Write a protein that holds these residues in place. Structure first.
Motif, short mmCIF file in Angstrom:
data_model
loop_
_atom_site.label_atom_id
_atom_site.label_comp_id
_atom_site.label_asym_id
_atom_site.label_seq_id
_atom_site.Cartn_x
_atom_site.Cartn_y
_atom_site.Cartn_z
N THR A 286 39.81 37.23 48.12
CA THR A 286 40.32 38.52 47.66
C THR A 286 39.58 39.69 48.28
N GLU A 287 38.28 39.58 48.49
CA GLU A 287 37.46 40.71 48.89
C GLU A 287 36.16 40.18 49.49
N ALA A 288 35.69 40.84 50.55
CA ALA A 288 34.43 40.43 51.17
C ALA A 288 33.83 41.61 51.92
N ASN A 289 32.52 41.78 51.77
CA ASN A 289 31.76 42.77 52.52
C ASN A 289 30.37 42.20 52.77
N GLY A 290 29.44 43.06 53.19
CA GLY A 290 28.09 42.62 53.45
C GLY A 290 27.30 42.22 52.22
N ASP A 291 27.83 42.44 51.02
CA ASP A 291 27.13 42.17 49.78
C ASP A 291 27.63 40.94 49.03
N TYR A 292 28.94 40.69 49.03
CA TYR A 292 29.47 39.59 48.23
C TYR A 292 30.81 39.15 48.78
N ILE A 293 31.23 37.97 48.35
CA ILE A 293 32.58 37.45 48.56
C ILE A 293 33.18 37.15 47.20
N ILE A 294 34.40 37.61 46.97
CA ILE A 294 35.12 37.32 45.74
C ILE A 294 36.32 36.43 46.08
N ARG A 295 36.35 35.25 45.48
CA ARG A 295 37.51 34.37 45.49
C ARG A 295 38.04 34.32 44.06
N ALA A 296 39.29 34.72 43.87
CA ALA A 296 39.80 34.91 42.52
C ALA A 296 41.32 34.84 42.52
N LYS A 297 41.88 34.78 41.31
CA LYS A 297 43.32 34.83 41.11
C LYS A 297 43.64 35.67 39.88
N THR A 298 44.56 36.61 40.04
CA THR A 298 45.06 37.40 38.92
C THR A 298 46.17 36.64 38.18
N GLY A 299 46.41 37.06 36.95
CA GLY A 299 47.52 36.53 36.17
C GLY A 299 47.93 37.54 35.12
N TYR A 300 49.21 37.50 34.75
CA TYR A 300 49.74 38.41 33.73
C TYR A 300 50.71 37.63 32.85
N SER A 301 50.27 37.33 31.62
CA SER A 301 51.07 36.59 30.65
C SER A 301 51.93 37.58 29.86
N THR A 302 53.24 37.58 30.11
CA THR A 302 54.15 38.54 29.49
C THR A 302 55.18 37.94 28.55
N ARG A 303 55.54 36.67 28.72
CA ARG A 303 56.72 36.14 28.04
C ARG A 303 56.44 35.74 26.60
N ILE A 304 55.20 35.38 26.27
CA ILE A 304 54.84 34.97 24.92
C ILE A 304 53.66 35.82 24.47
N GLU A 305 53.74 36.35 23.26
CA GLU A 305 52.68 37.18 22.73
C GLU A 305 51.43 36.33 22.47
N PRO A 306 50.23 36.92 22.59
CA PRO A 306 50.00 38.32 22.98
C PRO A 306 49.94 38.50 24.50
N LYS A 307 50.51 39.59 25.00
CA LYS A 307 50.50 39.85 26.44
C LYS A 307 49.08 40.11 26.92
N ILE A 308 48.64 39.35 27.92
CA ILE A 308 47.27 39.40 28.40
C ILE A 308 47.25 39.42 29.93
N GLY A 309 46.25 40.10 30.48
CA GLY A 309 45.97 40.06 31.91
C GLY A 309 44.74 39.20 32.16
N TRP A 310 44.85 38.32 33.16
CA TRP A 310 43.80 37.39 33.55
C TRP A 310 43.16 37.83 34.86
#
Ligand code: VBV
Ligand code: VBV
Ligand code: CL
Lengths: 242, 242
Positions: free
Chosen positions: A174-198
């Motif tokens: 997802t992101e990389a520079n001279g300080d860190y590397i981020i490997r990640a995945k976003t998610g957005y649960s919308t169809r069943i309550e409660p709606k949450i972002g991952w």
């Protein structure tokens, strides 16, 4: 092993938000979170499920490599970046749901269930529709369970080829520079309550890796960037990134 | 095949400098440079040799994986980041020569020579010390030859395992955001004239990959940052990165 830091709640309240951030220090084998109870509550994984789904499609030959092109079906959908051809890299990056629904149909219920059982992934339940159960079916996973799954992937310990695990970790970039590397995945649960972002993944440093798994209440799409903003604020508070 | 675009020379003259940038559009199979003669002039690779060196060490099991820790030998050297333990990721990031000299000694001259011939790498000559020939021995490689070597690495077509090539491409990770990924390796030839700086690698886009190889005159270490800055200005002018 696990320790609670409620100071992080300030970063959620600053945005009228509520959620949990779970950090795991790999070198130290020690974890931190602002909410021990929510850290262990199970939610729909939504598009964070694209991590196991990718691993399974790769290991079974449904996807041959990260260059294979999955051509747009011609149906114009609401998210513009979905209305184009994709490979595994860009399908992950833009959370192209229709591409992964095709993966799930090709994998099938039998192979999907057996793989999730072997992954020890969440409650290992694929009840619901074969091509949408991670959005509105019976599967559930906690933030700490996401981290336990991510650690196995980091160390190449899942029951798929090391090649499949290396390809998915490349696609999580997802992101990389001279300080860190981020490997990640976003998610957005919308169809069943409660709606949450991952937002789940890890931060690679020179000397260590910090695994993270966060989710937060997300009533609309407008606040989705708060996932990234708040996690980084915690990373900055804990002196992990500058 | 190669189109000369000497408007890029402006980017060198602004900074009191001279050199060559070479680009390869992979989709279109067309190349671009500001100086075709210098693009084919063969120099010492310096620490850009850490790419093939890494591949050979991994394929021979001299390096087990990107996590294996190689302890500092205890000698304090002039570059402070060298005076610590490293893995393959950080040894490449900080161009830790003594770590790679140990790799080269374990590889040995016979296998090093055989591998560079299999790689079609430069003039394939390793005369000199096996643990310093890329700094002061007989090996020479041009910018276009770096491109052709990197193209094989990108496509997993070098005569090593796919695993070794995937690990080295991971270790080449330099920069990544929502717009591009750069996998690349710096080099600084200091022991034999002419003193030059290198930057070789490629830029991954959503729909294409742009290979690049640049070198420039580098009489003092104060100008080493111009390798990335000049390359990026060329990339900016060509609408490759924003
Ligand atoms: O219900 S639909 O099938 O139309 C649907 C639409 C959009 C999404 C979606 C939104 C945001 C993200 S992400 O920002 O978290 O990556 C990932 C996926 C999921 C399902
Ligand atoms: O001759 S010594 O053995 O003391 C020596 C000192 C420094 C370097 C060096 C410098 C800069 C870079 S980089 O900026 O291109 O990464 C890479 C390597 C190599 C050899
Ligand atoms: Cl990577």
């Amino acid at each position: 092993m696990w320790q609670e830091n409620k100071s992080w709640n300030a970063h959620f309240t600053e945005h009228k938000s509520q959620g949990v951030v779970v950090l795991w220090n790999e070198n130290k084998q020690q974890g931190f979170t602002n909410n021990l109870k929510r850290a262990n509550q199970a939610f729909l994984p939504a598009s964070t499920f694209k991590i196991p789904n990718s691993l399974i499609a790769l290991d079974l030959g449904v996807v041959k490599d990260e260059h294979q092109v999955f051509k747009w079906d011609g149906q114009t959908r609401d998210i513009a970046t979905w209305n184009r051809d994709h490979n595994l890299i860009t399908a992950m990056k833009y959370s192209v749901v229709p591409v992964y629904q095709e993966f799930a149909r090709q994998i099938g219920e039998a192979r999907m269930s057996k793989m999730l059982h072997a992954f020890d992934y969440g409650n290992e339940d694929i009840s619901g529709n074969v091509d949408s159960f991670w959005l509105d079916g019976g599967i559930r996973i906690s933030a700490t369970e996401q981290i336990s799954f991510l650690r196995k992937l980091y160390h190449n310990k899942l029951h798929v080829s090391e090649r499949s695990q290396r390809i998915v970790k490349q696609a999580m970039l997802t992101e990389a520079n001279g300080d860190y590397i981020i490997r990640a995945k976003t998610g957005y649960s919308t169809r069943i309550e409660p709606k949450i972002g991952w937002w789940v993944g890890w931060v690679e440093l020179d000397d260590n890796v910090w695994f993270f798994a966060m989710n937060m209440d997300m009533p609309t799409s407008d606040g989705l960037g708060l996932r990234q903003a708040i996690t980084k604020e915690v990373l900055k508070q804990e002196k992990i990134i500058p």
